[PDB]
């Protein structure tokens, strides 16, 4: 599924991401925009052979099992394919674990490079939340 911006904002808000670990909702929407262009089915392969999955491009090196990232962890205890669902629950719940792990949203490269330090509230501007 390709979410609309506000649709995703609302979904993320419903799933408890607004101000989760201090990260306002726009951070999460911004991260999703730049990680996946709001596409739950996005996948990208990393240089190490892991793959990033879903709307928040959660990687299989650490967070999910895709059966083809040897030596990896599955810290969200999910098949990576669960992160491609139109239902963002699995991605959100995994993202909550990630963002809680001490590095905050810096885990999301796109967030660090394209959202961090910007006016992320713009990403939820106009949305009914
Ligand atoms: C939370 C999450 O999974 N974020 C993704 C990053 O992990 C991806 O970065 C890449 O991650 C792999 C596995 O750890 C690293 O081997 C790789 O070096 C790293 N790539 C970069 C440029 O840092 C990122 C890839 O775009 O996608 C999500 O942000
Ligand atoms: Cl868009
Ligand atoms: Cl915000
Ligand atoms: Cl694996
Ligand atoms: Cl959802
Ligand atoms: Cl933080
Ligand atoms: Na990415
Ligand atoms: Na894994």
Q: What share of the chain is helix, strand, coil (3-state, %, to 5)?
A: 40, 10, 50
- Which ligand has the nearest atom to the CA of 124? 3
Phi, psi of 16 (to 5 degrees): 85, 20
Domain covering 5-124, topology? Lysozyme (1.10.530)
Residues noted as catalytic: 35, 52
CA atoms of 119 and 123, how far apart (whole Å)? 8
CA atoms of 104 and 98, how far apart (whole Å)? 7
In this structure, the chain runs to a length of: 129
Return residues with CB closer than 5 A to ligand 8 (ion). 60, 65, 69, 72, 74
Q: Which ranges of 1-129 would DSSP assign to H, the alpha helix? A: 5-14, 25-36, 89-99, 109-114
CA atoms of 62 and 59, how far apart (whole Å)? 6
Q: Which residue has the tokens 């607004």?
A: 18
Running DSSP on this structure, what letter comes out for residue 65?
B
CA atoms of 109 and 10, how far apart (whole Å)? 23
Q: Which residues of 95-113 are buried (b: 16+ CB within 10 A; e: fewer)?
A: bbebbeeeebbebbebbbe
Method by which the coordinates were obtained: X-ray
Strand order in the sheet with 58-59: 43-45, 51-53, 58-59
CA atoms of 12 and 7, how far apart (whole Å)? 9
Neighbour-count burial of 25, counting CB atoms closer than 10 A to its CB (0-12 exposed, 13-18 middle, 19+ buried): buried
Radius of gyration of the chain from its Cα atoms, rounded to whole angstroms: 13
55 neighbors 39 (Cβ within 8 angstroms): yes
Q: At what angle do helices 5-14 and 25-36 cross, to 10 degrees?
A: 130
């Amino acid at each position: 599924k390709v979410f609309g911006r506000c649709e995703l904002a609302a979904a993320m808000k419903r799933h408890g991401l607004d101000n989760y670990r201090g990260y306002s909702l726009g951070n999460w929407v911004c991260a999703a925009k730049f990680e996946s262009n709001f596409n739950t089915q996005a996948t990208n392969r990393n240089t190490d052979g892991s793959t990033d999955y879903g709307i928040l491009q959660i990687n299989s090196r650490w967070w999910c099992n895709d059966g083809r990232t040897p030596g990896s962890r599955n810290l969200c205890n999910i098949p990576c394919s669960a992160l491609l669902s139109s239902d963002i629950t699995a991605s959100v719940n995994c993202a909550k674990k990630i963002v809680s792990d001490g590095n905050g949203m810096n885990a999301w490269v796109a967030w660090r490079n394209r959202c961090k330090g910007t006016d992320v509230q713009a990403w939820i501007r106009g949305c009914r939340l």
